[PDB]
Amino acid sequence: ELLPEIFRQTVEHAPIAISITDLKANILYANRAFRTITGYGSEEVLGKNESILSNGTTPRLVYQALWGRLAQKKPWSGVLVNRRKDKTLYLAELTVAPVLNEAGETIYYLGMHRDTSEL
Amino acid sequence: LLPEIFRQTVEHAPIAISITDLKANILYANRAFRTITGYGSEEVLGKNESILSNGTTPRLVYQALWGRLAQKKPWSGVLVNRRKDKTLYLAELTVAPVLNEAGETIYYLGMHRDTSELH
Ligand SMILES: Cc1cc2nc3c(=O)[nH]c(=O)nc-3n(C[C@H](O)[C@H](O)[C@H](O)COP(=O)(O)OP(=O)(O)OC[C@H]3O[C@@H](n4cnc5c(N)ncnc54)[C@H](O)[C@@H]3O)c2cc1C
Numbered sequence: 081e082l083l084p085e086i087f088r089q090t091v092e093h094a095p096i097a098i099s100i101t102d103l104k105a106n107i108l109y110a111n112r113a114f115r116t117i118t119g120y121g122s123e124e125v126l127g128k129n130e131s132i133l134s135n136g137t138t139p140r141l142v143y144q145a146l147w148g149r150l151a152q153k154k155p156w157s158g159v160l161v162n163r164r165k166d167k168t169l170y171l172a173e174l175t176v177a178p179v180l181n182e183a184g185e186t187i188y189y190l191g192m193h194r195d196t197s198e199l
Numbered sequence: 200l201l202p203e204i205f206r207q208t209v210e211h212a213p214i215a216i217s218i219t220d221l222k223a224n225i226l227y228a229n230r231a232f233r234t235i236t237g238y239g240s241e242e243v244l245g246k247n248e249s250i251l252s253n254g255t256t257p258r259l260v261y262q263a264l265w266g267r268l269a270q271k272k273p274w275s276g277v278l279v280n281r282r283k284d285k286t287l288y289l290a291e292l293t294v295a296p297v298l299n300e301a302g303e304t305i306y307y308l309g310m311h312r313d314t315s316e317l318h
């Protein structure tokens with residue numbers, strides 16, 4: 081073993097925005113980069129849905145594509161315009177991936193994104 | 200969330216992540232690392248990070264990175280790495296000590312992005 085608790089610490093400080101959600105997309109965990117990019121804090125992010133990031137201007141068919149891959153237990157990648165807490169907007173390169181149990185069943189989702197702005 | 204979920208998170212993160220012993224032998228590499236560097240899941244666990252080195256990168260960069268890690272401090276900068284297929288890529292790399300509860304180094308962590316577009 082690598083000591084197992086090094087993985088959480090690695091997530092926490094990785095320089096990519098990372099959230100982990102239940103099957104509803106309610107946020108169970110978010111790392112520091114997520115907090116820095118999106119603007120939401122440590123206590124306030126928990127239990128909110130990912131949709132909080134949408135500047136309600138993403139076409140429904142982008143999301144349909146994202147959820148369509150998830151329902152097939154496959155990852156998806158795309159770009160979308162997200163909104164920070166301060167209402168500024170950024171082009172997000174988003175990957176979402178299912179976490180599968182031994183049986184091949186989805187038990188969480190991983191949301192992992194970069195903010196592609198150069199300021 | 201159990202530690203396995205964070206290991207899965209690291210494994211699927213869209214940034215190269217490697218964890219090494221204190222002489223930079225790779226003990227763990229995620230999918231992005233293996234894809235970017237060209238080393239597969241078995242052979243990469245017999246490599247050292249030095250297999251990425253190459254002469255486009257000034258040697259003082261390697262001295263810089265080590266001089267910070269040995270102080271228990273991170274280093275962030277840029278270097279040119281060599282893949283298994285012998286192509287080269289400009290990487291933006293952060294390395295950090297992984298510390299136990301007494302503040303002593305137990306592993307090193309590397310996280311990098313591949314800035315290439317023509318590979
Ligand atoms: C891990 C993860 C990360 C995500 N990151 C983002 C992000 O960074 N930015 C962002 O805008 N959104 C993100 N989402 C998608 C987000 O959860 C919402 O579905 C989305 O923002 C649209 O929500 P709405 O309330 O605006 O539209 P809604 O009308 O609620 O959803 C729009 C469409 O998405 C699909 N859909 C929504 N909910 C579900 C469901 N539970 N199951 C199957 N299909 C569904 C449907 O096609 C629906 O028409 C992420 C989801 C996951 C799981």
Ligand SMILES: Cc1cc2nc3c(=O)[nH]c(=O)nc-3n(C[C@H](O)[C@H](O)[C@H](O)COP(=O)(O)OP(=O)(O)OC[C@H]3O[C@@H](n4cnc5c(N)ncnc54)[C@H](O)[C@@H]3O)c2cc1C
Nearest residue numbers: 219221222223247248249251252261265280294307308309
């Ligand atoms: C986590 C991590 C990630 C790294 N990522 C990269 C990367 O992406 N690209 C890259 O080219 N290099 C990377 N390095 C640096 C790498 O360890 C080498 O220093 C570098 O590749 C030059 O290799 P070299 O053959 O000239 O070996 P030298 O640096 O000459 O060192 C000789 C050998 O000893 C090891 N080493 C070097 N310094 C020390 C020391 N102070 N203590 C013990 N062992 C040491 C080296 O890795 C190598 O195996 C990373 C190092 C670490 C710890």
